[PDB]
């Protein structure tokens, strides 16, 4: 068996098993009850039908795998954005649990990112409806959304903590200059550093690199010397060591699908372009997962401009990078 093609799905991993859920395609959200598992050592798939509080089928959800427990936040279904939070213990028939979190949740959102640090899930950014005044951060409307939709939407720079000891939402008080509001950025965690690269804001797909110190809540902008990757959204950014982040794919401001790959060297603050055999397989809105065997496993996404919906080339291919 092989999963149907898709973009905007989630893929999370424990370093050996990759769990794939959700997304959409063209003849259409994929079936909500299906969980696809890819064994990274053997390269074979297995479909599991889940039960319990199965989430609606969505694209743009934000998921993590912590100690083989999957957590899912936010996303976009046929009736718009959500801020619901789910848990699926993958450690018998797997059962989704919708969690009743305490505290003030983030605004309903998709295309965001997350950092995992000890007992905390830390969510940043995204695209969705207007929040409430009490939320710390900034929100910027997408002007185009006032004619396309019944509810206008926009970008945020919000940082929210979900504390898994109590399933309670909070917001930290940060110092430094946060990145601008953005969506379709990519987040990656190494140690106590929550890195974020690129994303869409206003009329640009950006090339900037920041990290949030997850001990001190201080924001830092990184300015690597020399050649940097072109700005983009819908890319992946994946930790592959205690000193390296792996970047692949995405979409430029001028709407060019990308097949370039790079390593960011943290200790050197330097980007290194990565040579690979997939130069003719650009991907945007794919997922990337690191394996315990020195590989990055890219799945799904679209080979061309998926904003032209009737021509979109959604994929079900596995691309394997040896980093």
């Amino acid at each position: 068996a092989c999963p149907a093609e898709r973009s905007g799905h989630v893929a999370v991993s424990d370093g050996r098993h990759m769990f794939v859920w959700g997304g959409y395609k063209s003849n259409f959200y994929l079936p909500r009850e299906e969980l696809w598992i890819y064994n990274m050592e053997t390269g074979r798939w297995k479909k599991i039908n889940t039960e319990g509080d199965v989430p609606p089928s969505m694209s743009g959800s934000c998921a993590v795998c912590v100690d083989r427990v999957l957590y899912l936040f936010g996303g976009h279904h046929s009736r718009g954005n959500t801020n619901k939070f789910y848990m699926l213990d993958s450690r018998r028939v797997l059962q989704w649990e919708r969690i009743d979190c305490q505290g003030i949740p983030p605004s309903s959102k998709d295309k965001l990112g997350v950092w995992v640090y000890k007992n905390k899930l830390i969510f940043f950014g995204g695209y969705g409806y207007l929040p409430e005044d009490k939320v710390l951060g900034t929100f910027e409307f997408d002007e185009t959304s006032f004619w396309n939709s019944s509810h206008p939407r926009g970008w945020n720079d919000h940082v929210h903590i979900l504390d898994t000891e109590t399933f309670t939402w909070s917001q930290p008080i940060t110092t430094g200059k946060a990145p601008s509001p953005r969506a379709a950025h990519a987040c990656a965690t190494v140690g106590n550093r929550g890195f974020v690269f690129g994303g869409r804001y206003r009329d640009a797909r950006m090339n900037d690199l920041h990290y949030l110190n997850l001990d001190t809540w201080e924001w830092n902008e990184l300015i690597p010397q020399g050649i940097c990757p072109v700005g983009r959204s819908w890319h992946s950014l994946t930790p592959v060591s205690s000193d390296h982040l792996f970047l692949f794919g995405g979409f430029t401001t001028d709407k060019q699908p990308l097949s370039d790959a790079w390593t960011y060297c943290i200790s050197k603050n330097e980007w290194i372009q990565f040579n690979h055999p997939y130069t003719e397989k650009p991907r945007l809105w794919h997922t990337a997962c690191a394996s315990d065997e020195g590989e990055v496993i890219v799945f799904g996404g679209c080979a061309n401009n998926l904003l032209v919906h009737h021509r979109a080339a959604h994929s079900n291919e596995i691309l394997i990078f040896s980093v």
Partner: peptide
């Protein structure tokens, strides 16, 4: 509607 904001 699901692709906006990127």
């Amino acid at each position: 509607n699901n692709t906006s904001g990127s």
